[PDB]
Design a protein around this ligand. Structure first.
Ligand SMILES: Cc1cn([C@H]2C[C@H](OP(=O)(O)O)[C@@H](COP(=O)(O)O)O2)c(=O)[nH]c1=O
Ligand SMILES: [Ca+2]
Length: 129
């Protein structure tokens, strides 16, 4: 896998962000995760977490997997990195997301996230509380 540059356009919610990629605007959906809806418990906090992570970053990178790069809604599907830290993984580690939507061909970082989820659960963090 390889990291490509992008710049924040706008935070959206816990697992979507508007990014400029190769000069075009696009909504990215975070691979391998599911966060509560804004109206559901921990939904606001998930959004606030992702927002801070991406807004504070000096450098946002996008990392496509080996399979589908766009979903049925036209959203990009990627691992997003904020100053070299993976947002997908961070949310899961904080118990602000669950591992989810694991499809074959787009699951390189599955075991990594599951490990983070194992440790979030062990600590009864956020959704595991
Ligand atoms: C994460 C992810 C979601 N999706 C689709 C599945 C869901 O379809 P349905 O809307 O038909 O349920 C939807 C969930 O996204 P949200 O969790 O952002 O709503 O996004 C993909 O197709 N690929 C993926 O890698
Ligand atoms: Ca969601």
């Amino acid at each position: 896998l390889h990291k490509e540059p992008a710049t924040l356009i706008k935070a959206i919610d816990g697992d979507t962000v508007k990014l400029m990629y190769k000069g075009q605007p696009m909504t990215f959906r975070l691979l391998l995760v599911d966060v509560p809806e804004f109206n559901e418990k921990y939904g606001p906090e998930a959004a606030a977490f992702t927002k801070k992570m991406v807004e504070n970053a000096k450098k946002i990178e996008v990392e496509f997997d080996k399979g589908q790069r766009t979903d049925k809604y036209g959203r990009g599907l990627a691992y997003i990195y904020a100053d070299g830290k993976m947002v997908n993984e961070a949310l899961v580690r904080q118990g602000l997301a669950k591992v989810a939507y694991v499809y074959k061909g787009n699951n390189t970082h599955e075991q990594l996230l599951r490990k983070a989820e194992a440790q979030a659960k062990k600590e009864k963090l956020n959704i595991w509380s």
